[PDB]
Design a protein around this ligand. Structure first.
Ligand SMILES: *[C@@H]1O[C@H](CO)[C@@H](O)[C@H](O)[C@H]1NC(C)=O
Lengths: 50, 40
């Protein structure tokens, strides 16, 4: 298995473990590279699909 | 063209990495010569 490193987005990356989410408590979180800290609450915003 | 406002939502994102300088369109034709619908 040979891995070629070219000037490409390199789609073949691999897996990454995920954990259960907790709400109503200050916590540091990672959301697909979005790193933050705070409390997560059920929201009302009408996020259109994309 | 009609007068109005309507934003264009994204639809396609392709990681190709090609130059692209020239482009052409395509259309569908039917044999009767041939008859093509009125379009612009
Ligand atoms: C893309 O094509 C144009 C027109 O032939 C050319 O001038 C330009 O150098 C090309 N860019 C490349 C090959 O990166």
């Amino acid at each position: 298995l040979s891995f070629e490193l070219l000037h490409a987005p390199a789609t073949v990356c691999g897996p990454k473990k995920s954990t259960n989410l907790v709400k109503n408590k200050c916590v540091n979180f990672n959301f697909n590279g979005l790193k933050g800290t705070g409390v997560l609450t059920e929201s009302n915003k009408k996020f259109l699909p994309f | 063209l009609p007068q109005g406002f309507s934003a264009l939502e994204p639809l396609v994102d392709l990681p190709i990495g090609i130059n692209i300088t020239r482009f052409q369109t395509l259309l569908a034709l039917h044999r009767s010569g041939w008859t093509a619908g009125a379009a612009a």
